[PDB]
């Protein structure tokens, strides 16, 4: 919605810069935002499904890394 | 005067024709006995004198063919990526890299 353009072009460059990328096309940014959202709805769909399983109405960092665990990736320092 | 020329399908015609024929075949490609042996020499330094069930080889070959053909479509995509129709050793190195096993 409004926050999907909130992932800004320098921030995408900063991700690319952290990623070692020197030159970036102008068409990278919007479809990279799309790849970001498809990843976000997938992970948060799993995380929220874990959340209403617990009779809960907030999602937790524990549930996030738990969804990540299902998806395959693990995060540390955020519980779990 | 008029000298003969043989009937030769052009470079690529024969290619795509056997592509359509092989993409309809389910039969295994790598031959059975050649493959079976491929294993018995690999399973030497792990342990000597193994025996193998009459299914394990078939499972391990057809499995290898599945792994190799799945590597081969994205190898084809990596070759098309550089606007080429020839695949190169760099293509499968990149494939195995991005799967995360190089």
């Amino acid at each position: 919605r409004d926050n999907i353009q909130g992932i800004t072009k320098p921030a995408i460059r900063r991700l690319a810069r952290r990623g070692g990328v020197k030159r970036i096309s102008g068409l990278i940014y919007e479809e990279t935002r799309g790849v970001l959202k498809v990843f976000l709805e997938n992970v948060i769909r799993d995380a929220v499904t874990y959340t209403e399983h617990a009779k809960r109405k907030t999602v937790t960092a524990m549930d996030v890394v738990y969804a990540l665990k299902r998806q395959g990736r693990t995060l540390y320092g955020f519980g779990g | 005067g008029g000298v003969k020329k043989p009937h030769r399908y052009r470079p690529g015609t024969v290619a795509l024709r056997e592509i359509r024929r092989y993409q309809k075949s389910t039969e295994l490609l790598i031959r059975k006995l050649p493959f079976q042996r491929l294993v018995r020499e690999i399973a030497q330094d792990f342990k000597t004198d193994l025996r193998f069930q009459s299914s394990a080889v078939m499972a391990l070959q057809e499995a290898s063919e599945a792994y190799l053909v799945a590597l081969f479509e994205d190898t084809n995509l990596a070759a098309i990526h550089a606007k080429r129709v020839t695949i190169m050793p760099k293509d499968i190195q990149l494939a195995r890299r991005i799967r995360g096993e190089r």
Binding site: - | G2, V3, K4, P6
Partner: protein, 111 residues
């Protein structure tokens, strides 16, 4: 001479080609011998009448498929000897000169 399965050099247009003799035909007996035994012509088997009065050989061109297999008489067949091999080289040189003349006329057509 000529033997079943032996090498031979044969006409084909203006040029010489190597061939295998698979059958040997005798005009008097209306019969031919073959390789895997005398036998007559089959239902679908026939020999052109220009040569069928002379001694024919069914031959297979080397480096070319069975669709080129044909009956040839003494006019079109010769034994595989050094004289025939040498005139085969000579006619190969004639074909080379024809190809060179083709190259010359096309490069003059380009200009």
């Amino acid at each position: 001479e000529f033997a079943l399965g032996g090498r031979c050099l044969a006409f084909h247009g203006p040029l010489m080609y190597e061939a295998k003799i698979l059958k040997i035909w005798d005009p008097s007996s209306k019969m031919y011998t073959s390789i895997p035994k005398p036998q007559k012509l089959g239902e679908d088997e026939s020999i052109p009448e220009e040569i069928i009065n002379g001694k024919c050989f069914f031959i297979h061109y080397q480096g070319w498929k069975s669709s080129w297999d044909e009956w040839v008489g003494y006019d079109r067949i010769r034994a595989y000897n050094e004289e025939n091999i040498a005139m085969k080289k000579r006619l190969a040189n004639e074909a080379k000169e024809a190809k060179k003349s083709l190259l010359e006329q096309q490069k003059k057509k380009k200009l």
